[PDB]
Amino acid sequence: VFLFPPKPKDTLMISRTPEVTCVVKFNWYVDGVEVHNAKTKPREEVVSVLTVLHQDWLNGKEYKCKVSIEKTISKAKGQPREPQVYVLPPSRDELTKNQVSLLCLVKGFYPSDIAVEWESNGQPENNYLTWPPVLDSDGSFFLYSKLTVDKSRWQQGNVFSCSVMHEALHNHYTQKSLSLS
Amino acid sequence: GPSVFLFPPKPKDTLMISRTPEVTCVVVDVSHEDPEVKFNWYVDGVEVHNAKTKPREEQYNSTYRVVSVLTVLHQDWLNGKEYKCKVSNKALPAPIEKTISKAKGQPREPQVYVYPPSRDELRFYQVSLTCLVKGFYPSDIAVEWESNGQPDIFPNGLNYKTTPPVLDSDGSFALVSKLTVPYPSWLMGTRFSCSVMHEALHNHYTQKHLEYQW
Amino acid sequence: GGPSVFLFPPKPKDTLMISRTPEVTCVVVDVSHEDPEVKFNWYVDGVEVHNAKTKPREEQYNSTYRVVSVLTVLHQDWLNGKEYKCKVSNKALPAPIEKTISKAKGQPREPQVYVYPPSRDELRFYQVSLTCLVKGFYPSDIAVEWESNGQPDIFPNGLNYKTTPPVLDSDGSFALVSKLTVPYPSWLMGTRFSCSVMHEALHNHYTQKHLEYQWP
Amino acid sequence: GGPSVFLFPPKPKDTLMISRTPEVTCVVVDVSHEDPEVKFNWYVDGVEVHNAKTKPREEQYNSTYRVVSVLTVLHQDWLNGKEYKCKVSNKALPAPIEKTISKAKGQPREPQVYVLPPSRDELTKNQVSLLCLVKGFYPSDIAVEWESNGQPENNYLTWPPVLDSDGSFFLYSKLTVDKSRWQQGNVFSCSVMHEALHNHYTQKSLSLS
Amino acid sequence: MVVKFMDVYQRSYCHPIETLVDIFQEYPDEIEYIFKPSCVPLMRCGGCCNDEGLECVPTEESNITMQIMRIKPHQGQHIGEMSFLQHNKCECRPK
Amino acid sequence: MVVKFMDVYQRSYCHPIETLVDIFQEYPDEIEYIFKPSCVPLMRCGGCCNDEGLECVPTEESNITMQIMRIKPHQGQHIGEMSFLQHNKCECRPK
Numbered sequence A: 001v002f003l004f005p006p007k008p009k010d011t012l013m014i015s016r017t018p019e020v021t022c023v024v025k026f027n028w029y030v031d032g033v034e035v036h037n038a039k040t041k042p043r044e045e046v047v048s049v050l051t052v053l054h055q056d057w058l059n060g061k062e063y064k065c066k067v068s069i070e071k072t073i074s075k076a077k078g079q080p081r082e083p084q085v086y087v088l089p090p091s092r093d094e095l096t097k098n099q100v101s102l103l104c105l106v107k108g109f110y111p112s113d114i115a116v117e118w119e120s121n122g123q124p125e126n127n128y129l130t131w132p133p134v135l136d137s138d139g140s141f142f143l144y145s146k147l148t149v150d151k152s153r154w155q156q157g158n159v160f161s162c163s164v165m166h167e168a169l170h171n172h173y174t175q176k177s178l179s180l181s
Numbered sequence B: 001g002p003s004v005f006l007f008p009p010k011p012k013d014t015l016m017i018s019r020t021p022e023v024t025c026v027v028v029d030v031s032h033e034d035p036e037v038k039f040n041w042y043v044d045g046v047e048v049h050n051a052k053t054k055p056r057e058e059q060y061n062s063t064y065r066v067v068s069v070l071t072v073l074h075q076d077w078l079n080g081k082e083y084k085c086k087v088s089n090k091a092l093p094a095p096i097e098k099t100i101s102k103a104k105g106q107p108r109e110p111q112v113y114v115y116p117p118s119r120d121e122l123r124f125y126q127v128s129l130t131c132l133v134k135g136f137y138p139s140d141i142a143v144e145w146e147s148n149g150q151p152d153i154f155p156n157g158l159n160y161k162t163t164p165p166v167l168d169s170d171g172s173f174a175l176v177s178k179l180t181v182p183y184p185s186w187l188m189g190t191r192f193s194c195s196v197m198h199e200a201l202h203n204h205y206t207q208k209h210l211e212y213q214w
Numbered sequence C: 001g002g003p004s005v006f007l008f009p010p011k012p013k014d015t016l017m018i019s020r021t022p023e024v025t026c027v028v029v030d031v032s033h034e035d036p037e038v039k040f041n042w043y044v045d046g047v048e049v050h051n052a053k054t055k056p057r058e059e060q061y062n063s064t065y066r067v068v069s070v071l072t073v074l075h076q077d078w079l080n081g082k083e084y085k086c087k088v089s090n091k092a093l094p095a096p097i098e099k100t101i102s103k104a105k106g107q108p109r110e111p112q113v114y115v116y117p118p119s120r121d122e123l124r125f126y127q128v129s130l131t132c133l134v135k136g137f138y139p140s141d142i143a144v145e146w147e148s149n150g151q152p153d154i155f156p157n158g159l160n161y162k163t164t165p166p167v168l169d170s171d172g173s174f175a176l177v178s179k180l181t182v183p184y185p186s187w188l189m190g191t192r193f194s195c196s197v198m199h200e201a202l203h204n205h206y207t208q209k210h211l212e213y214q215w216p
Numbered sequence D: 001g002g003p004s005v006f007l008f009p010p011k012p013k014d015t016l017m018i019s020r021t022p023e024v025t026c027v028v029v030d031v032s033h034e035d036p037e038v039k040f041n042w043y044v045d046g047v048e049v050h051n052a053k054t055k056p057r058e059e060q061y062n063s064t065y066r067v068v069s070v071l072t073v074l075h076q077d078w079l080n081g082k083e084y085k086c087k088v089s090n091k092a093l094p095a096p097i098e099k100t101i102s103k104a105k106g107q108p109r110e111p112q113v114y115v116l117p118p119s120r121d122e123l124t125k126n127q128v129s130l131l132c133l134v135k136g137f138y139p140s141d142i143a144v145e146w147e148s149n150g151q152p153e154n155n156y157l158t159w160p161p162v163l164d165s166d167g168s169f170f171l172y173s174k175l176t177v178d179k180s181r182w183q184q185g186n187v188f189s190c191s192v193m194h195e196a197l198h199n200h201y202t203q204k205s206l207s208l209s
Numbered sequence E, F: 001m002v003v004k005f006m007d008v009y010q011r012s013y014c015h016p017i018e019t020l021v022d023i024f025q026e027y028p029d030e031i032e033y034i035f036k037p038s039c040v041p042l043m044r045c046g047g048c049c050n051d052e053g054l055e056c057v058p059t060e061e062s063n064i065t066m067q068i069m070r071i072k073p074h075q076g077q078h079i080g081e082m083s084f085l086q087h088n089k090c091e092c093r094p095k
């Protein structure tokens, strides 16, 4: 069995529903106490999804999935750290091409649970690649996210923004913007 | 039952003729009652008798760790030859078999781009230099940083970390390498270089340089 | 050439405190490696005595031994003017060497002790000087020390004082000065410094003068 | 052995005041009545000088002679560290005896002079003790005097220099005065002369007030 | 020799440095007294930053108590325990 | 804890202390430039004396050479050697 934690974005936004995924009769125990608010998705020729509440996962509660094998998962322990967010404009060499890479550097955060997205002019940009966190030399994590855009969109002067969500950020959210010049 | 893991040669060893590429076959969870392990190496089906086996290792969890290494020729791995490691033990009824080979597909030349720190990062004493490497295939690659401040400024080496390569949207691989240096070493004009080794590069090697710009 | 002999008296503090043990020390230098054995014979007012303490020979940088013998003495014997003789016999000596020592004869005289605070001119330095004048005493045998009521927190390494050797004054008595160097704040904070003098002509062989900062 | 030689330096006050004459003194003792001849050769940094003066032979009580040779030297030569050598030749010696002397080497340090009034305890006596403290000087060559209302004092005692904990020297000089003279308000002065002093001279005074 | 740029810049960079502070600067209203020592050594933020738009400020503070002697000219003196602010951590921050 | 009066008075007494000195104030003629670091660490006399009538002053000085980034607006910039005056001995002397 593979017990996946919720998605970082779900646990940080109240509107969304964070849920543990007990990928394989199911029985869930929150720090011992049993719960029956779980569900079972159609068997795919199975997955049990346990809806959790935000503050409990973020407060380090432990979630066990016991199917009839016991496996448990919980948020990583340790002093959290606020992510630093930097945006790097395209390099001179890459401007000789039809597409350019916009980079978002996020370093110095703990735990590794984090969400990154891009957007422009109020619309979400979808053509981006985010590497998984890397353990840095000081015990914290860093990552990069790369947004690829047609050079014409960049040279026109449009503003592109890297949005980052982490538990240790004020309002669980911050943003850095980037444009020509 | 014991598990087997077969690792490929270091990208750096396969691209430099001065180095020795080798494929490594590791065995874990070996019990004390049945500690013996046999190794049968095969290339393109043909069996080979050149692997050197290293002695068992008592692990912290009371299991033994057996490893066998097989040297390979640079031209063999880069041409896509298939390598197999077969393991035999009394603890497993059927002998486990693992296979490794170089990824097939049109090789692609990596593009290398370097970036200075963001202005917002200067509130820290340590700043970040970035090297983007994208567009390359296969994923086998080596990335290092170098400086003309080595060794007089950086006697203990350079502090950099690199993402494992990930498949990008165009079917190629990409990674990022972050070099951390003190701000004055960047301010004083020290040159920093992102060095990339890949089979689709001229001489299997290229470099991009970074210096403080006024 | 040949070895030489030097006979030293007991420490004044030792002859004046019953707890302590005074001793006369007979030092022999320029002892050859070929003939390193030295025989010591001690006499007190002419009579021989056999309570002498032998010390292990000591190698010197000039490739020669320093052989020492120590004779303990009774307080009253030394103070009463008894003569102590060290006879030294060595294979390199055709005749043994003799040396005698005794307390200076003369009417004992009581020391006067006076303490002086630092001069105001000396405040330009972090370390200041406290002064103890001891005059009018005979014989020259005397002991001078400094004490302070300052806990070891103030002077963990003890007190740094030095004293002039006694010299003859215009009236036939001996006089000396002892200088105690202390940091100014230790003087400023009210530490009480004491000059302790031990001499045979003093009642109980001991007196003391005290010194501390004074405020208008 | 035989005759012994002792070479003495100039008096500190003589090397410091231009009016005075510094001199090095070569004293030869244990000279026999059989071989009473003594020749002196003087050298300054190896170069021979010829201005020396031999004093009349002096017969001692142990039936030996004492022969002295005095060499006048220059103030700056002595203070600049020149080396003065006395060579003594006598028929009773296998070879001549050579002795050398020169000013102590090292950075000279200026003395600080402090005058201490008598303690209250001693004010019950017919005479009080005024003290002059001189510390922190180098080399140890130094001179000390007392004065009062111009006239120099006579009843004072000066101890020789003592090596202090920091490698410099210090001494005390004690002036004995009648208590009436002190309590009358007279001014007493300690005069110190040393190489490292401005004009080789300083003076400190104190009086009841 | 010459001090290398690496060493100069590092030692000059924003950090808590032992600084001699006039007691009166910390107690500007205690006018009627003389203090001995008149100055105290306190860890305080000092040094330069990587950008003129940044300033070296304290981010962690604490107090330290020291025995200072207080003198009233025509009355007396006494040793008391005065407290001072010291800077435990310093960082470059936008103004 | 408390710092004992003994330790406070000693640490604050006249002596050479590492001090951060602005370069412009040591090179007021070179006002046409900008320096990185703008401040350099120099041993300078500081601290208090045993009397208010005394002041902590240097008794023997020395020169020290340091590599500094000299920036001239819109003309250029380079690491250049600059000499500074430092204090090796201090003493309390009357004002």
Ligand SMILES: *[C@@H]1O[C@H](CO[C@@H]2O[C@@H](C)[C@@H](O)[C@@H](O)[C@@H]2O)[C@@H](O[C@@H]2O[C@H](CO)[C@@H](O[C@@H]3O[C@H](CO[C@H]4O[C@H](CO)[C@@H](O)[C@H](O)[C@@H]4O[C@@H]4O[C@H](CO)[C@@H](O)[C@H](O)[C@H]4NC(C)=O)[C@@H](O)[C@H](O[C@H]4O[C@H](CO)[C@@H](O)[C@H](O)[C@@H]4O[C@@H]4O[C@H](CO)[C@@H](O)[C@H](O)[C@H]4NC(C)=O)[C@@H]3O)[C@H](O)[C@H]2NC(C)=O)[C@H](O)[C@H]1NC(C)=O
Pocket: C004, C006, C008, C009, C011, C025, C027, C029, C030, C060, C061, C062, C064, C066
């Ligand atoms: C081989 O080396 C050894 C040792 O190495 C050397 O040791 C030191 C001292 C330096 O020399 C180093 O460079 C070197 O490494 C040589 O051994 C030395 O030999 C000389 C003789 O040639 C002796 O000189 C005598 O010293 C005494 C004083 O001794 C005390 O003080 C010394 C100060 O350093 C100290 O080292 C001694 O150990 C000793 O210390 C005392 O010890 C006692 C006992 O333990 C203790 O209770 C005391 O508290 C302690 N005190 C102190 C302060 O430490 C000195 O008094 C002698 O002077 C008299 O005799 C001379 C020659 O006769 C004469 O010139 C003097 O003017 C004086 O003359 C009068 O003599 C009569 C009787 O003879 C006497 O009644 C009078 O009172 C006296 N005075 C007057 C005014 O009349 C003498 O100078 C060294 O002490 C001795 N060193 C040691 C460590 O033993 C050895 O010579 C070398 N050999 C060769 C061939 O070169």
Ligand SMILES: *[C@@H]1O[C@H](CO[C@@H]2O[C@@H](C)[C@@H](O)[C@@H](O)[C@@H]2O)[C@@H](O[C@@H]2O[C@H](CO)[C@@H](O[C@@H]3O[C@H](CO[C@H]4O[C@H](CO)[C@@H](O)[C@H](O)[C@@H]4O[C@@H]4O[C@H](CO)[C@@H](O)[C@H](O)[C@H]4NC(C)=O)[C@@H](O)[C@H](O[C@H]4O[C@H](CO)[C@@H](O)[C@H](O)[C@@H]4O[C@@H]4O[C@H](CO)[C@@H](O)[C@H](O)[C@H]4NC(C)=O)[C@@H]3O)[C@H](O)[C@H]2NC(C)=O)[C@H](O)[C@H]1NC(C)=O
Pocket: D004, D006, D008, D009, D025, D027, D029, D030, D060, D061, D062, D064, D066
């Ligand atoms: C026969 O008699 C004569 C003289 O007659 C006698 O005189 C007096 C003393 C009475 O006893 C009388 O009854 C009697 O008749 C004897 O001659 C004597 O011989 C001894 C040695 O055998 C000499 O000892 C040396 O003395 C010097 C100091 O001398 C000055 O001070 C004396 C008083 O303290 C004074 O008497 C002297 O005249 C002399 O006075 C100085 O004179 C000069 C110029 O004239 C003047 O500028 C000065 O101002 C003035 N000073 C004063 C105070 O007045 C002493 O320093 C010597 O010590 C060194 O040598 C020792 C032995 O070599 C050694 O142990 C010491 O440690 C020291 O040497 C150390 O080591 C080396 C030496 O190897 C040396 O280079 C180092 O520098 C030194 N180390 C240190 C750290 O310093 C020495 O003790 C007497 O001076 C001398 N008397 C006279 C008047 O000349 C004769 O010995 C008799 N014969 C026999 C067989 O016994």
Ligand SMILES: *[C@@H]1O[C@H](CO)[C@@H](O[C@@H]2O[C@H](CO)[C@@H](O[C@@H]3O[C@H](CO[C@H]4O[C@H](CO)[C@@H](O)[C@H](O)[C@@H]4O[C@@H]4O[C@H](CO)[C@@H](O)[C@H](O)[C@H]4NC(C)=O)[C@@H](O)[C@H](O[C@H]4O[C@H](CO)[C@@H](O)[C@H](O)[C@@H]4O)[C@@H]3O)[C@H](O)[C@H]2NC(C)=O)[C@H](O)[C@H]1NC(C)=O
Pocket: B003, B005, B007, B008, B010, B024, B026, B028, B029, B059, B060, B061, B063, B065
């Ligand atoms: C008792 O303790 C033992 C030691 O701690 C345990 O051994 C470990 O067992 C686990 C599983 O039981 C293995 O997990 C696998 O690891 C593979 C990667 O191994 C590399 O990385 C690990 C950690 O980073 C390192 O310790 C290894 O030594 C190995 O390092 C590489 O070694 C090669 C050989 O020379 C070298 O060339 C490389 O440079 C070097 N790289 C690094 C970074 O060090 C994974 O790839 C495996 O992946 C599985 O899952 C994949 C996804 O599904 C799948 O594609 C794969 O096919 C595979 O199934 C797997 O996760 C540990 O490697 C192993 N450690 C060692 C040292 O052997 C033992 O299990 C334990 N026994 C118990 C508890 O009963």
Ligand SMILES: C[As](C)(=O)[O-]
Pocket: D106, D107, D108, D109, D137, D138, D166, D167, D168
């Ligand atoms: C330290 As010095 C030899 O100058 O007194």
Ligand SMILES: C[As](C)(=O)[O-]
Pocket: E078
């Ligand atoms: C200033 As108070 C010693 O009287 O408390």
